[PDB]
Amino acid sequence: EQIAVEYPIPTYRFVVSVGDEQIPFNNVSGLDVHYDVIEYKDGIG
Amino acid sequence: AITPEQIAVEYPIPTYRFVVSVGDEQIPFNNVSGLDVHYDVIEYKDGIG
């Protein structure tokens, strides 16, 4: 009983601080982590 | 309509799947090359052609 449901956080409820001061921004993007892929192949498969 | 046996019999073989044995042991490898046979050429010319 009492199934609990949670919804994701809205995207507009964010606060940005640069250095040690808070600056009201309008849009922040690009916080991505990217790793290269190294591949090695042998003759036997 | 071509069956896999027909491909095994008549089609050419690719060059990416191979096994290498060194002495009495098998060692995986990434690239093998240089398996060439070369002969020298001996020439002799006559005065009449």
Resolution value, angstrom units: 2.5
Gap between the Cα atoms of A40 and B28, Å rounded: 12
* Residues B28, A40: C-beta atoms closer than 8 Å: no
Which of B18, B35, B40 minimizes the C-alpha distance to B27?
Answer: B18
Beta-ladder partners of A37:
none
On chain B, the residues whose CB falls within 8 A of the CB of A42 are: 28-30
The structure was resolved experimentally with: cryo-EM
Gap between the Cα atoms of A6 and A23, Å rounded: 30
Gap between the Cα atoms of A30 and A1, Å rounded: 42
Interface list for chain B against chain A, based on CB atoms closer than 8 Å: 16-20, 28-30, 32
**Contact, B41 vs B48, CB < 8 A?**
no
